[PDB]
Design a protein around this ligand. Structure first.
Ligand SMILES: CCCOc1ccc(OC)c(F)c1C(=O)c1ccc(C(=O)N[C@@H]2CNC[C@H]2NC(=O)c2ccc3[nH]ncc3c2)cc1
Length: 340
């Protein structure tokens, strides 16, 4: 009868409890970790596959230099990433298990997702079939619906920020540019191929940019390249603001229509931003075969599952220059990160 859904609830609840109960409390841990590999780098730090010595559990630890963040005046964005990650809760959002900080660095310890970024699989495959891209796009749509319901804008949608877990589902990562926006915001951020026209025009924008990004994402996933690709960034921006997009011949009619409605330069005509909102996308003919409830419950069988070999295997990840992380004997920028 209905007793099996109780067993499913109990199993998911035990997984959640274990994942809560083994991590250290916030700002209580020290470098008590074996550092295995760098999974990505940025202006102020890196993300490392990491093994907690006392537990043997593996995580992805984002390490950030406090001095570098302060010198480039990016305190608010890093605090935003930590606060948003610790405040949200959704199946397709990466989980922040715990966090700490020392004399030099900020540490955001997240769940480890061994399947790698979607960008790697897309580059090695060439492009996804339209059902594959639809499987990914439905999760992105639900995630944006949740986030926008929370008045949050993601602002960093790109194939590199979408990890694939062992079940083939998406884990959205990198929230350094996510921001709780009531009304408008003006910050220039995001990769050039995914920038919305209102961002390029420096006009002030809202959550609609996310939906624009989705269009781009879908296009890329279905074509193997972004819609406004060019060699120089200036031509990329010219093509983005031009209001013109050419689709490959293999694109179906429904996909072309959806993309034409998502890539609307006019904010007042872009899907996701209209009166019906996200429903305008969820009721589109391209998504007619999509069981939104089943996708949310992760009951749909994925079209692609990465080949794994246990936690600690990083074959699905690119290789980066490994560095030694040193912590000063003196505390840097303490009052600046008192809320972290
Ligand atoms: C132009 C660059 C400017 O860089 C900043 C700009 C602004 C800023 O302010 C907030 C910054 F801090 C920075 C940074 O320094 C920064 C340091 C490292 C990374 C990074 O590694 N990115 C990965 C590469 N592609 C996806 C990312 N993957 C995960 O995040 C992740 C998470 C959990 C996971 N679990 N399993 C796998 C797994 C993966 C990104 C930025």
């Amino acid at each position: 009868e209905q007793e099996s859904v109780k067993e499913f609830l109990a199993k998911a609840k035990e997984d959640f409890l274990k994942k809560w109960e083994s991590p250290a409390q916030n700002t209580a841990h020290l470098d008590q970790f074996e550092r295995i590999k760098t999974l990505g780098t940025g202006s102020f730090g890196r993300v490392m596959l990491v093994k907690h010595k006392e537990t043997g559990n593996h995580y992805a630890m984002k390490i950030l230099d406090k001095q570098k963040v302060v010198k480039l005046k990016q305190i608010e964005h890093t605090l935003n990433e930590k606060r948003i990650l610790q405040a949200v809760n959704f199946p397709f959002l990466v989980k922040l298990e715990f966090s700490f900080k020392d004399n030099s660095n900020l540490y955001m310890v997240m769940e480890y997702v061994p399947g790698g970024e979607m960008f790697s699989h897309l580059r090695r495959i060439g492009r996804f079939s339209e059902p594959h891209a639809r499987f990914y796009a439905a999760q992105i749509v639900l995630t944006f619906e949740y986030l926008h319901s929370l008045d949050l804008i993601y602002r960093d949608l790109k194939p590199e920020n979408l990890l694939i877990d062992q079940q083939g589902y998406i884990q959205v990562t990198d929230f350094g540019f996510a921001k709780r926006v009531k009304g408008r915001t003006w910050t220039l951020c995001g990769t050039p191929e995914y920038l919305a026209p209102e961002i390029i025009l420096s006009k002030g924008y809202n959550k609609a940019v996310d939906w624009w990004a989705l269009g781009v994402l879908i296009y890329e996933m279905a074509a193997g390249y972004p819609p406004f690709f060019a060699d120089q960034p200036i031509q990329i921006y010219e093509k983005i603001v031009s209001g013109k997009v050419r689709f490959p011949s293999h694109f179906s009619s429904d996909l072309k229509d959806l993309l034409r409605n998502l890539l609307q330069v006019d904010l007042t005509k872009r899907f996701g931003n209209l009166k019906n909102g996200v429903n305008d996308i969820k009721n589109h003919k391209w998504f007619a075969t999509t069981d939104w409830i089943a996708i949310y419950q992760r009951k749909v069988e994925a079209p692609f599952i990465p080949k794994f070999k246990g936690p600690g295997d990083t074959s699905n990840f690119d290789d980066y220059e490994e560095e030694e992380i040193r912590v000063s004997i003196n505390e840097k920028c303490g009052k600046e990160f008192s809320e972290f």
